[PDB]
């Protein structure tokens, strides 16, 4: 009968995702609220695999870096990477679902469009 309790706003440090270095506002890390914490969490999860570092929990980590280095053809690894991203990102309770649109083949650089569904 009682309704589900809403997840409280996730607050933590902030920085520019392109800078990859923490930023300080007059000595205070920038506050992240609403759709600010989930981007940081996804960036942290995707950027580094757990199996490289013993400290992280086993559920953490992604296996997209296995596809790095051209270990298999693109045709099936497109769907394989979609599934890998889905496994790596839906572990977060905040995130509801993740959708992958397609992949673009050009030279050696692969570009893909992936979608994120959130609560707030």
């Amino acid at each position: 009968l009682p309704k589900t309790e809403e997840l409280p706003i996730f607050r933590e440090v902030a920085w520019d995702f392109e800078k990859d270095e923490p930023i300080l506002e007059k000595g205070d890390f920038k506050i992240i609220e609403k759709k600010e914490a989930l981007k940081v969490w996804i960036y942290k999860c995707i950027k580094t695999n757990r199996y490289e570092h013993e400290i992280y929990s086993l559920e953490y980590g992604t296996e997209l870096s296995e596809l790095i280095g051209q270990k298999y053809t693109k045709g099936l690894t497109e769907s394989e990477a979609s599934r890998f991203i889905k496994e790596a990102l839906l572990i977060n309770p905040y995130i509801l679902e993740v959708n992958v649109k397609s992949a673009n083949f050009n030279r050696d650089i692969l570009s893909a469009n992936v979608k994120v569904s959130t609560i707030y």
């Binding site: 995702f17 392109e18 759709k35 981007k39 996804i42 960036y43 995707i46 950027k47 997209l64 790095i68 650089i109 992936v114 994120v116």
Partner: protein
């Protein structure tokens, strides 16, 4: 040899907002002497006085929603009007109010506002206490001896409060017959006097439906010309017209000047974009679902006469196909779908 997955999130908004919900606040204080943009509630600088804090608190709440943006500037009372005009030129605003606007100051403000609206094509509005000016962009609230919460309030205080309330008023809703719970004590007025005051173009408070509300939402302009008509006597119509004007001007400046060239295909693309924007407006109840976008054909005739090309011996379509010399002429048919406040039906 080292390459990374760099993903940057993208958010899509079906509705685009531009120059809406802006409140321009200027107060005369000798301590702060600066501009303060307030985006979070209960954000009070220590420099501002108690009366200025009361003004801010009045501007804080709205009827339905909190006003989107509250912008406050502080300077000494001397030479306040010039700096206020310069700052309002620097940063766009939607509504204006002054705690200590004298009649000369109000007249100067109205003249500047109408000059902007008529030359600069900048659609701005101002709320003033006692102004008999001949423009619809200004708002005249002539209600004396107003007391809110068993506290005496000046005319300008309640004009600022009403401006903040209107800033929170949605476009679907109408300001007519909106009750105020905070207002408790008002001098007793007769229905005939209230009706006469409303017919004069003034905004007043009435005690109706067991509450204190405003009788109407007409513009301060008493004399509307023959073309303007009855609907132009309402602030609701002019608000959406100004919003459409601002959005069209903004998109034109963003896209078509410089970046886009002049061509028949460019004209068709511009027409398609205008039609899409009109359809987006049609999604809201603000305007009617039926509208047309067309090339101003008689303007093309006039341009040809200026050029001097004879109108005979070609198809009329060639007029549209003919280059307009880095110019575009357009015609649009629109109608404001603003619904009804008070009604009158019959029985059998």
């Amino acid at each position: 040899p080292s390459i990374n997955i760099s993903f940057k999130e993208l958010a899509t908004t079906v509705k685009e907002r531009s120059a809406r919900g802006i409140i321009a606040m200027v107060l005369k204080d000798a301590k702060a002497l600066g501009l303060n943009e307030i985006h979070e509630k209960e954000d009070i600088p220590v420099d501002l006085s108690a009366e200025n804090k009361e003004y801010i608190n009045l501007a804080l709440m709205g009827n339905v929603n909190t006003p989107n943006k509250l912008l406050v500037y502080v300077i000494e009372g001397e030479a306040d009007i010039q700096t206020a005009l310069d700052f309002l030129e620097t940063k766009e605003f939607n509504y204006l109010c002054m705690p200590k606007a004298v009649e000369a100051d109000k007249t100067a403000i109205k003249n500047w506002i109408i000059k902007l609206r008529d030359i600069d094509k900048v659609k701005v509005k101002a709320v003033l206490g006692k102004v008999v000016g001949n423009h619809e962009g200004i708002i005249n609230f002539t209600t004396e001896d107003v007391l809110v919460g068993e506290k005496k309030y000046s005319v300008d205080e309640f004009t600022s409060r009403v401006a903040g309330l209107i800033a929170g008023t949605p476009l679907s809703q109408s300001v007519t017959y909106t009750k105020l719970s905070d207002v408790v004590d008002i001098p007793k007025m007769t229905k005939v006097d209230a009706e006469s005051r409303v017919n004069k173009g003034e905004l007043i408070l009435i005690k109706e439906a067991g509450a204190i509300r405003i009788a109407r939402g007409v513009n301060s302009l008493t004399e509307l010309t023959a073309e303007k008509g009855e609907m132009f006597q309402k602030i609701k119509i002019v608000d959406t017209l100004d919003i459409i004007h601002s959005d069209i001007r903004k998109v034109i400046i963003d896209d078509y000047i410089g970046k886009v060239t002049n061509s028949y295909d460019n004209k068709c693309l511009l027409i398609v974009a205008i039609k899409s924007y009109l359809e987006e407006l049609e999604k809201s109840a603000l305007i009617e679902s039926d509208s047309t976008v067309e090339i101003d054909f008689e303007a093309q005739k006039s341009y040809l006469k200026s050029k001097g090309v004879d109108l005979s011996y070609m198809t009329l379509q060639e007029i549209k196909e003919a280059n307009t010399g880095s110019k575009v002429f357009l015609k649009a048919k629109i109608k404001v779908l603003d619904a009804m406040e008070d009604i009158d039906l019959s029985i059998e």
